[PDB]
């Protein structure tokens, strides 16, 4: 049957090089290497006995530029033995990961045994064949109305959460993680904490246990105190575990990659060590491809029932969309859930600002039997009236409420009862998509049918 595993049932010796010809920053430059392999995980053995992993990055003939994940602090030329494993970094995956807590590099930290591998998969992964991809048309009844009815989430959606430093992205991402469920029929979850503080790590690791998800969530916790470069391989490890689960055991995985800005900062702090092309704002030029290698490991594939949803939480610095991390994340991903600092200050939970929020899989998974026929038109009409209300609120703050027209006053009323009665929601209150659409229609009934310039006449007649 499974003859593939037997082919790897062999022994291969490894070369131990005590030939470190220098080291500078996080880069260890070897010499006299016997046929170096580009991107081969390498186990360094420090003089003190500490074993630091590292992967080759440049293999100029008979020389290897090994970058170490844990940092070069303590590496000696005449004492370190650098041992070449002869194969790229691989995580030992199995169906037994689900329910375990791993470190940044995949070494379990739950006082449990090493993963009884069913197979070893290269963490970099491979680009899924675009002919084998399936467009995700199965919408997820997320539970939060601001997402379910506007900026809708499909199954293979890769929709990040954009949030400022202090906004409750974790609370929202936990609510989506705990209430997500297919609208017209659970999610295995894979987590990857990159640079989160211990408070956030414990919040997630406790919310999963509280909701019972921890029986089917594998956590890759790379906290702030973990090595900075390990955050490069943490999301690749998480997505390789998720790819195994989904596309091989046919599970529906909801991958969460918290603090993707920390991963981007790790990319910048590694590129600046190699003096690479500085792109924009100091982030490397190839950071588009580096983030794409992460995000594109999502979506359903043909012939396999599995699917990987992604919700990479992102912390926008200074709450600026134009920053390279949110900008390239918006270009690569298929949506965004913009958590708004202004809304959070106003006190609304969830502080989702639907105007910058987007979902590119909402033109599908809407209408007919997937959801009520009014969804597609109602979401657009809500967007239009919300924007009109925002513009009229600015005009009011400038000139005064006396100059607001009848339409502007209606927009103000709609905006108020929208932010304070449609975006707002209990932390543990889940709203079905039909109930959210009914509330949206209740809001829309402020306007007469004439002012609703976006709803089709048939939809207006049937539902207004």
């Amino acid at each position: 049957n499974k003859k593939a595993v037997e082919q790897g049932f062999n022994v291969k010796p490894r070369l131990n090089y005590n030939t470190v010809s220098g080291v500078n920053g996080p880069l260890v430059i070897l010499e006299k290497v016997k046929f170096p392999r580009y991107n081969e995980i390498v186990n360094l053995t420090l003089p003190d006995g500490t074993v630091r992993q590292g992967q080759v990055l440049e293999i100029r003939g008979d020389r290897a530029i090994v970058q170490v994940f844990e940092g070069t602090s303590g590496i000696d030329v005449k004492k370190t033995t650098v041992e070449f494993t002869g194969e790229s970094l691989r995580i030992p995956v199995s169906e037994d990961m689900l329910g375990r807590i791993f470190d940044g590099s995949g070494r379990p930290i739950d006082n449990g045994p090493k993963v009884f591998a069913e197979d070893y998969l290269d963490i970099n992964g491979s680009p899924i064949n675009p002919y084998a991809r399936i467009y995700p048309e199965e919408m997820i009844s997320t539970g939060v109305s601001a997402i379910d009815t506007m900026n809708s989430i499909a199954r293979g959606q890769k929709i990040p959460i954009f949030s400022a430093s202090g906004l409750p992205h974790n609370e929202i991402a936990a609510q989506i993680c705990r209430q997500a469920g297919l609208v017209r029929p659970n999610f295995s979850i894979v987590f990857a904490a990159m640079g989160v503080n211990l408070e956030t790590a414990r919040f997630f690791k406790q919310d999963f246990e509280e909701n019972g998800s921890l029986e089917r969530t594998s956590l890759f916790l790379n906290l702030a105190n973990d090595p900075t470069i390990e955050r490069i391989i943490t999301p690749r490890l998480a997505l390789t575990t998720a790819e195994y689960l989904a596309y091989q055991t046919e599970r529906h995985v909801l991958t969460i990659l918290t603090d993707m800005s920390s991963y981007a900062d790790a990319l910048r702090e590694v590129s600046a060590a190699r003096e690479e092309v500085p792109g924009r704002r100091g982030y490397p030029g190839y950071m588009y491809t580096d983030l794409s290698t992460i995000y594109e490991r999502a979506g359903r594939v043909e012939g396999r029932n599995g699917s990987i949803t992604q919700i990479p939480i992102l912390t926008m610095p200074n709450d600026d969309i134009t920053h390279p991390i949110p900008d390239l994340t918006g270009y690569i991903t298929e949506g965004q859930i913009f958590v708004d600092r202004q809304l959070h200050n106003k006190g609304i939970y969830p502080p989702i600002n639907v105007l910058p929020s987007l979902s590119r899989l909402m033109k599908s998974a809407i209408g007919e039997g997937m959801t009520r026929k009014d969804h597609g038109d109602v979401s657009n009409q809500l967007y239009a009236k919300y924007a009109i209300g925002k513009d009229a609120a600015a005009m009011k703050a400038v000139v005064g409420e006396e100059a607001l027209s009848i339409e502007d006053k209606l927009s103000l009323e709609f905006l108020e009862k929208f932010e304070k009665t449609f975006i707002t929601q209990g932390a543990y209150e889940d709203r079905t998509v039909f109930e959210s659409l009914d509330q949206a229609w209740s809001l829309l009934r402020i306007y007469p049918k004439e002012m609703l310039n976006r709803i089709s006449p048939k939809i207006l007649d049937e539902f207004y």
Binding site: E58, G61, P127, P130, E276, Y288, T289, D327
Partner: protein, 593 residues
Amino acid sequence: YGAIYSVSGPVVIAENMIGCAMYELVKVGHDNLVGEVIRIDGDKATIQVYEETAGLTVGDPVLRTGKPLSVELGPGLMETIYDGIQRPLKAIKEESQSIYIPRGIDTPALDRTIKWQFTPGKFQVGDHISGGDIYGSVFENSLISSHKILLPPRSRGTITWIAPAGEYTLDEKILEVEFDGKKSDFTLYHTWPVRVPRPVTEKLSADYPLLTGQRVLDALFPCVQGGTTCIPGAFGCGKTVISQSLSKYSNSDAIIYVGCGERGNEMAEVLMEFPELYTEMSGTKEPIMKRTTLVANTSNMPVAAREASIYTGITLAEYFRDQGKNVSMIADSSSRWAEALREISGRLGEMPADQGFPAYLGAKLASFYERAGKAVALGSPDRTGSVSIVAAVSPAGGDFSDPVTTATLGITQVFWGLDKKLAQRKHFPSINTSVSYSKYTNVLNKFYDSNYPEFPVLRDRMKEILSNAEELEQVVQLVGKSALSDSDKITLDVATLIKEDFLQQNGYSTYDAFCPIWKTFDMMRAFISYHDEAQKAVANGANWSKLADSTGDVKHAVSSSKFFEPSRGEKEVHGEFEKLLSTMQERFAESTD
């Protein structure tokens, strides 16, 4: 055969390689990864590899193929999806039995097994045949029927043996040319270097409009068949949707969609949606997918392959122009090509230009956009093809000051600049009418005079209305609407109506997926007539405050004219618009009486 000597991402400096030419194609590594040479320093020739370089080892043999990056042209191009390099994704998947692109797959570019109904052209044995002459047409599909088999542009001489009509595979010889005593055998397919543009007899001024089917585009910023186009805009502005709604419903005969650094699910959406749509052209309801080929090099697929995907797409479009088809190549995320160039230059260590990009980015983009343009094909019979390039430049951070955007605006004749602010409000396609322009408006007078004579007059009138109301709204936002006159208030209301019911075109909707030229012209006439008659009524002495309540019915009928489904036929929708105009005139007459 040389040997690898250094690997640093997508660059492989290969030693012991005396004899490799610039931009030659090499097979780097044991898996025979496809790579091209870009720099030569003695023996060591620096190779960029169009495949994942991870796992390469120093000493891995690299084979010099002896030919630049060549795309195979011929039958079977249509209705298929390709990777950056010319590899069929379907064939790759069925060969690998997996869902991943394996490293080093060498599937033939065009399906050899499928047999095509070759029918010889006018050329007979002994007649001199020059480059680009048509010596037969193969029945590709029901839509691209008579896929006329051109001779290679560089080939010349006299026919010695031409195959009779029948069924032939690509490997089967179809014609043998004798030239100076050296006979050369030609088949249904011929390779072509992607970097080298395909020759044409003479380019021509592009005087026919590429009807995008979207009201804002083909009514304010037209694109002609053969004109370079650019669509800058931040993420979510709608460049991809404009490109898809152009490749779904344009008047182009064949379409070469290029997803250079796009999303995988976008290409999957195209693959599942194009077979479900049918083009009314060719006198039948043939599917769209029978006329579109796709070059899918998604964002995470090898960085170097993005350039190969762009060049392969434009070469396919050039071939289908030489056949005589109005091609419309669409380079999705053309800025990802610039980013791939930046990444490769950073690997090479070359000195950067503005913002990390190499110094030759402008030259490469200019030479790429100059491939477009209507041109008479190379050989007999006389053929007039056209390639229209609609490339979506993706600015970094949403600012049009990006070097790729500037180097694209310097060459493209059209600029469909998208606005993120209008995109957020779902005001779609979010074309920024303030900055967008089309240099083909003057050229299209010769077509708008023949059909829809009042179209340019309406276009300048609506641009005037939009500009005047934009300036007035800018003033009002800081000085209040108190000082506006009745005419200014009418301009504000009319332009708000235009933006919210004419310029906005809700794609993925039954009624407004494709608003053709005749329905666009009629809606444009209705809006302009509403503005003009409202201004005449206010000049006659009627107060605008009362007139708004009196003519809300007419205003809502005008705003609801976009709901007239174009599938009802040109005669039916034109009749409905004539009735609406009559009702509008009667309502204003009654109100002003």
